[PDB]
Design a protein around this ligand. Structure first.
Ligand code: T5T
Ligand code: T5T
Ligand code: MG
Ligand code: MG
Ligand code: MG
Ligand code: MG
Ligand code: MG
Ligand code: MG
Lengths: 6, 236, 236, 6
């Protein structure tokens, strides 16, 4: 799973 | 460089076409060629560079995680020996990912960062440097692991220091930097309290500054604020 | 061949891992290496080969269509001259697609088809030959366009002839062959009536044979029958 | 647009 990054 | 013979403007035009076609590897190669022309990048051009490489490495990271999970289960008790193939293929994807990260870090060091004097360019590039060291840290196991982690931390920290002095708390680059540095703390540095504190302070300081924004700026800032809130919800 | 030093079984294992990781270019390279070992393929191995290359070329075709659409609008009346870049990049994607099709057609000709004596292998490979000539036909504009179209037709027709003699009307290979040959008629040969007739006859003959099937075979056959019905709905 | 093929 990926927490949100930009 | 295979793009050395193409006009800078043609590389940028083709990067935009490649984005529309979802050909992110081509997009990244075009933007690498544009960077290698030696001229500074505009805001839109920095966006093209970052979008291209984020999509390339993002796919590699997703594949690496699938393969690492399979490898971890193949090494559990009671699992059957499948041979070296899972490790070999995980290593192949890992080496390709490391190669892309080294390419991006190479563009930043030669010579994007040293020529970036405005906050909006310098913070953006230092954020990218932190991001690509973070991706290296996700796969690192050797003698240099702690130095890779600290290279990410150091780049993010310099970006934070400049952004706090030179940008409003709603600036989307500052918000995205804080979002990603918070994820670095949670996932890489084993510092969930620092991750949560950074996300919360960033969100609250941005909230208090939204009243200064136009509707278009408000939309950009609140989009990233929602990502901070999403992570806080995941973590608390 | 870069895969020449890897064990056949390891290539197949890695193709399956690449599928799980959605790394279809790797999957195709692994399966090319397996074909080049010179041994015939099993049913599962033919599926791996076809899935890998269908996904690679499918992405290329989607990108080619985006770029061709942009190119067509850039050539309309009142559009502004953007220079050679759209055509050049469309040509670059087109050449890469043609290269993949030539690679697959090369595997089929050297020497998958000539060694395929059972209906389920020979029909599958001739269907693939029709598919990859069809993809070449989608982009063809030169002196050999009609011969490319006829090479697709000829391969599909030989596959149809064998499938009608040697397979039940519910066989999923026979159904998928008919589905794709019907699309060839509609999109490549400018023969929508033949496309609709083939899809309808194939659907009806399969319907009448479903009563012979187990529940698992029924699921496979009805899945492809639904695709035939979907196309008929699009076309009528 | 792509009609269905397998
Ligand atoms: C997510 C959003 C709104 O903003 C940011 C902010 C900071 C970044 F490091 C990257 C993107 C965006 O899509 N911008 C266009 C690509 S630069
Ligand atoms: C769509 C379905 C059910 O069947 C076919 C039938 C004919 C073909 F040429 C390809 C696939 C499938 O996914 N099969 C596994 C990949 S071979
Ligand atoms: Mg020039
Ligand atoms: Mg390694
Ligand atoms: Mg603090
Ligand atoms: Mg051997
Ligand atoms: Mg051409
Ligand atoms: Mg007929």
């Amino acid at each position: 799973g990926f927490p949100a990054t930009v | 460089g295979a793009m050395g013979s193409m006009e800078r403007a043609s590389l940028i035009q083709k990067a935009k076409l490649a984005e529309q076609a979802e050909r992110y590897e081509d997009m990244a190669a075009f933007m690498k060629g544009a960077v290698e022309k030696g001229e500074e990048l505009s805001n839109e051009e920095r966006c093209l560079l970052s979008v291209a490489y984020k999509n390339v490495v993002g796919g590699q990271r997703a594949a690496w995680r699938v393969l690492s999970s399979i490898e971890q289960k193949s090494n559990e008790e009671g699992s059957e020996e499948k041979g070296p193939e899972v490790r070999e293929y995980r290593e192949k994807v890992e080496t390709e990912l490391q190669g892309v990260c080294d390419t991006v870090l190479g563009l930043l060091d030669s010579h994007l960062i040293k020529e970036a004097g405005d906050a909006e360019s310098r913070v953006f590039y230092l954020k990218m440097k932190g991001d690509y060291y973070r991706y290296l840290a996700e796969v690192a196991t050797g003698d240099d692991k702690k130095r890779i982690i600290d290279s990410a931390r150091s780049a993010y920290q310099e970006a934070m220091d400049i952004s706090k002095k030179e940008m409003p708390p709603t600036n989307p680059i500052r918000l995205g930097l804080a979002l990603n540095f918070s994820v670095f703390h949670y996932e890489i540095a084993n510092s969930p309290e620092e991750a949560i504190s950074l996300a919360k302070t960033t969100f609250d300081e941005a909230m208090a500054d939204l009243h200064t924004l136009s509707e278009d700026s408000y939309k950009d800032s609140t989009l990233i604020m929602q990502l901070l809130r999403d992570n806080l919800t995941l973590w608390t």
